[PDB]
Structure formats: structure tokens, C-alpha cells
A paper describes a structure:
Thus, to mimic the presence of the GluA/B residue, the variant RBcel1_E135Q was generated to determine its structure with G3. The activity of this variant was dramatically impaired with ClPNP β-G3 as substrate, with a k cat of 0.219 ± 0.009 × 10−3 min−1 and a K m of 0.263 ± 0.041 mM. The kinetic parameters strongly indicate that both the glycosylation and deglycosylation steps are affected by the substitution of Glu135 with a glutamine residue. The side chain of the nucleophile Glu245 is positioned as described for RBcel1_WT in monomer A and the apo form of RBcel1_E135Q. The mt-10° to tt0° rotation seems to impact the position of the side chain of Tyr201. When Glu245 adopts the tt0° conformation, as seen in monomer B, the hydroxyl group of Tyr201 is displaced by 1 Å compared with monomer A and the apo form of RBcel1_E135Q.
Residue numbers in the entry: 1 to 320
Amino acid sequence: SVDLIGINVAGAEFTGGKLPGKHGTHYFFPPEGYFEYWSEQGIHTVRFPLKWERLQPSLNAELDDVYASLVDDMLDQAKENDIKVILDVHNYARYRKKVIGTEDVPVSAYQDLMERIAKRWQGHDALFAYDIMNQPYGSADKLWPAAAQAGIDGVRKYDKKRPLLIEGASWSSAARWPRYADELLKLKDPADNMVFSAHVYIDEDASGSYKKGPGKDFEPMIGVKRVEPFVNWLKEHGKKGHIGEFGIPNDDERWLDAMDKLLAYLNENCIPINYWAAGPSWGNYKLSIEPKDGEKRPQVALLKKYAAKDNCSDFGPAKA
């Protein structure tokens, strides 16, 4: 099923400079009982960041036993709690800081990673989709379309059915999406099951850092206005879409109003969202919606309201 409302569950990609790092010290997978809470809240789709260097510390090599087994366990817990999982290679189109498509990181090495991910997990019922790369940006933008094709070809060697979530250049910006997405139109999927996934934050610079408050002339429609270029591109080209990241602070009604207006527009166009972020080890991080004693999470009420209004059977927007 295609749920319009989902959440990022972040933690396995934390402390990216510590490689391999130690589970429970530098990075964190869901503990036992984690998925039960979100399932009870009516949230059944999760986007799950993974760090490429931890899954595959040598290019072209077998996946790391320890880290890949933690993914096995998390997928098992998801299935036990009726959670659908989008695996996210959360790597900015880079491996050990080098862009996919340079001599350091050939596209064939990225294809190898995606083959191994699909080979290991295509048989797992909790796996819903592959978000093949988080936020290409900067020096990776030009080479990203060719890298995306290699990642698509990699998954399709072993999984010929599941959707592939294809992000865009410039941090997968929804607001700037049509400026760069021309070369994504040339991507070819033999299974014809690609879904484009953009990101949107509503601080001034759209980084999602929220260094300041809303500001005097804050526009409540800012979220809608920043996803319109993306949704209109989908309609113009007959494509399907998705929003892989959006989040807001908990400390101003203006943020919540903009979130409500955004969710209404996504609902009208059958565009799913993955809120950023839940996760087992966020502490007092400003964008965390994980429960924490004494910290309010008004964003969750909005996600629940729109989960009850989900009447879509597929990724939109519908061609009508």
C-alpha cells in the first residue's frame, strides 16, 4: 500500500566521521519495541537512512556483516509491527567524500552497492522501496543523473517490482526542482516504476537548520509554494512524486500552520511525505518528533490528522 503519511527514522547514519563506528555509541538502530509506538499512532511507512561506508567499507566488496545484520534485524522488527520501510542510502552522492562518477568512485561501484542491497533484501516483506541516494549536491550535481542510472540498473538486477525513489540535484530541492531535473527525464527503468522524491524545508535558506524564527512577514503558504514547482513538473511530464524530507521546529504556531497547508496540498495530489525526523537517539534536537519527557510534539497531531484523510491508492499526481 502507498501511505501518504510516513516518518524518517534516523540514527543509523549518525556520527559519519566514525567508520566503522560502534553501534550504541556512534550510531543507533531501533531498539526492541521501537516500531510498536509509531504503529499505534497510525504511522506505517518509515524512511530509514543508512551510511554507505558502514554497509560497504570497501568498494565492490561484500556487505559488512555487523551493519548489514542490524538492517536485517530492523526489517524483521518492521515486519512484526506492520511497518513499510524505504531504505535510504544517505550519502549525498559521495563515498568517503568523493563524488560518484569520479575516478575514486566509479559508477560501477555504486551499481555494485545497489545490486547487493537488492540481492539481500528483495525477499523481505517489510521492504517497500529504495531511495537510492539522499541529497546529491554541489560538485555531485552534474554527475548525479549518470550515477542514478547505474543505481537503477543495480537494483533491477535483483528486484524487478519495487519502486525506486529518485532524488534530484541541489539537495533534492523541491523549490528548484525543474531547474535541474531535465536530465532525470532520460533515466530508464526496465520495470517502469520510478518515483521522484524532493525535499522541502521552510526556513529562509531551505536547509532545515532553522537558525531563526519565522520572521515578521512569514508566508504561511511557503511550504506549498516551495513544492508547487516539483508537483507541476510531475504533472507536466506525467511522472509520480514523493517528499522524502520535511520538518519544522515545535516552538511557533506559524511553522505548524505552514505544515498544515503543505499537507493539504500534498493530499490533494496524492504525494506522500516522510517527516524529518523520528529516531531512537535524537535527544533535544530541534526537529525531533520522537517522544521525550517534557518536549512537546505538536507536529504529530498534524501527521495523524492527514493520515486519516489518506484515500490514495498510488503515488500521485493522477493524470486525470
